[PDB]
Amino acid sequence: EVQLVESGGGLVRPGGSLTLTCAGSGFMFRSYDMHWVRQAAGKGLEWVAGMGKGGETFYAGSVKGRFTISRENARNSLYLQMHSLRAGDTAVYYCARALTEWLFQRGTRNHYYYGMDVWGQGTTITVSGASTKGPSVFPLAPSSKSTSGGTAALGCLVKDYFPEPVTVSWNSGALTSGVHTFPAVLQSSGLYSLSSVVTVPSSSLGTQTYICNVNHKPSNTKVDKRVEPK
Amino acid sequence: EIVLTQSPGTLSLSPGERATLSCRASQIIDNKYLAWYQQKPGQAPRLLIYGASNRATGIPDRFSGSGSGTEFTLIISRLEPEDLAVYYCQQFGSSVYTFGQGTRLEIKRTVAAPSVFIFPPSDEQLKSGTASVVCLLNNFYPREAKVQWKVDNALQSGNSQESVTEQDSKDSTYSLSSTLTLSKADYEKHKVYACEVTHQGLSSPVTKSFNRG
Amino acid sequence: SAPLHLGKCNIAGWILGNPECESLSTASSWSYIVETPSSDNGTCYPGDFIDYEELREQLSSVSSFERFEIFPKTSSWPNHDSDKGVTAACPHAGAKSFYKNLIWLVKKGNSYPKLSKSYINDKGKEVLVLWGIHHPSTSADQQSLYQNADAYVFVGSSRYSKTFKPEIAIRPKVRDREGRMNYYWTLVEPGDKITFEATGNLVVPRYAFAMERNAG
Ligand SMILES: *[C@@H]1O[C@H](CO[C@@H]2O[C@@H](C)[C@@H](O)[C@@H](O)[C@@H]2O)[C@@H](O[C@@H]2O[C@H](CO)[C@@H](O[C@@H]3O[C@H](CO)[C@@H](O)[C@H](O)[C@@H]3O)[C@H](O)[C@H]2NC(C)=O)[C@H](O[C@@H]2O[C@@H](C)[C@@H](O)[C@@H](O)[C@@H]2O)[C@H]1NC(C)=O
């Protein structure tokens, strides 16, 4: 399978350093240009750095002098070393591969670019002086009342956590229909909080078991919480 | 030094209609260096068009790129709810890559009322000194929705936050969660807790409520 | 010292031996080259032609010019198949074909042993040598053509030293091909040895050119 996986993201002090790694598989690494593209929450895509097959490097004006891109085709690995990090560097950073090419045609050498082709899942970088701490997970237990329409809602409140993100699943991924995990909000304490919810037929409340699974990588936290009717 | 200005900023259209997206270059750009991308909610971008007019492999016939000079257009002939995403144009110039600011493609739908739910604080949170009261609004359209917190029939403000999901690629709805944070003392000092919801699909405001604490 | 008229072809088509192009093999000098620069009969199998503009200036005016068979087709390659290297990308006379002055070697049976071939310049003149490097589209074709998955090519002389690795990747179709072939040229000085090593992917010279140049 053609694939790209980013790793190395996390929390770093302003003015500090961090090195990202992109591992590829299913494809010949040396055949492709490699790129990093960052996206801040709710904002557009920003190209930051790129590299040719033969190792020449390219950089966006906003990162020249602070980021260094390198690749080791023997390890199928792209690297992005970062220093002098600023707050405005916080984003999810993507890895992407692309084909460029010179074709001899009509008597001249013609250059082509065929687009950024395979993208990674993204790894998140947060630049602040604040500290990491894992979330607390509280049940959002369905209503004992009502159930006449047959639809009940239940969920989990993932509260007081830094930094972003957490992931939430339900019943270890066996429950996906009707699941909504909301975008986190930054509350005045400097900590984020979100809730995941799912709506089920209210007759399921008496026969099904519901568990939310909460991942908070930056604090290495795995919390499974059962949501029972009150 | 190349800027791509992309318009319209947001595009609301119904399934089956044709979507025309524009990408304008601050300067003439060679066709072979313009690309288009799709970023569905929660996902990585997907390449759609390369060299202004050639489809990437695995991209259906209804996606078509065209244009020249400084004006470039992406076109989606027969919209589907799955086409919900943000669309970015890209260009190569001066050994640098730049994107456009993106175009929200929003899927128009029939009006759908939200089903409202309210959850009192958990006993686990209360012993830590804080109360959270959550009001869920589920699967509604259009997106504009108002949530009003009432603590013993007293309108609240400045103590509640909310966030909205992006539009569901299947039923084209939104969902909304609003949380009311209160100290344990303030929570146990009052009784009736309710959230008031007004929506286009609602003739009258809908109130859900509990009482304890 | 009449002009060298290439007809509908350009220098790349002539010098590589594109089957659409006349060899002009008896032309032993010329004042200048009459060319169709925009011809499609330069390179028929798609790829880059490294330093093409330099080669045009090298060949612009010659006072002596001799094509010779540097690596004779029927005998230079006893451990490799030199009789299958034709392609639909290079059609001629209704059949699959290839360049006149290059041989696209593939494996003999199911083994591509280590190729190593040398030419020592005894012509007393700068010798023009062209070769190609082939880049399959898939790992399947790499083994069908060359057996060895981690093939390499090495070309070395007094002025040139480079190892090539095959860049396997599916590329947009040019002349209905998803792989590529890159074309390279170099001059071998009087007395110097040029060595070709390869465990795959090498498009070997058949013909080379001994040249002296017209300058004043
Ligand atoms: C030799 O050159 C031919 C054309 O060169 C032209 O003729 C000579 C006389 C001279 O005037 C030159 O100045 C001219 O440019 C090649 O035929 C042409 O090949 C191109 C490349 O594919 C083709 O363009 C494409 O056409 C397809 C549709 O068929 C289209 O999808 C592409 O986008 C692109 O437009 C031309 O149509 C074609 N012209 C003619 C008249 O046939 C020839 O190429 C060989 O033959 C063609 C038909 C293809 O099979 C090629 O793959 C193949 O290599 C050249 N032959 C060699 C061996 O180099």
Author numbering:
A (entry chain E): 1 to 230
B (entry chain F): 1 to 27, 27A, 28 to 212
C (entry chain D): 55 to 82, 82A, 83 to 116, 116A, 116B, 116C, 117 to 133, 133A, ...
According to the publication:
The six antibodies with other light chains are quite diverse in the ways in which they contact HA. As an ensemble, they represent the products of multiple alternative affinity maturation pathways for head interface engagement. The light chain contributes one van der Walls interaction with HA Pro221. The combined breadth of the subject 8 antibodies, without an IGκV1-39 representative, covered 10 of the 12 HA serotypes, demonstrating that polyclonality and diverse V(D)J gene usage can achieve broad reactivity.
We describe a focused, protective antibody response, abundant in memory and serum repertoires, to a conserved region at the influenza virus hemagglutinin (HA) head interface. Known broadly protective antibodies engage sites on the major virion surface protein, influenza virus hemagglutinin (HA). These include the receptor-binding site (RBS) on the “head” of an HA subunit (1–5), sites on the HA “stem”, and a recently identified site at the interface between two heads of an HA trimer. Stem and head interface antibodies realize their full protective potential through Fc-dependent pathways that lead to the killing of infected cells rather than by blocking viral entry.
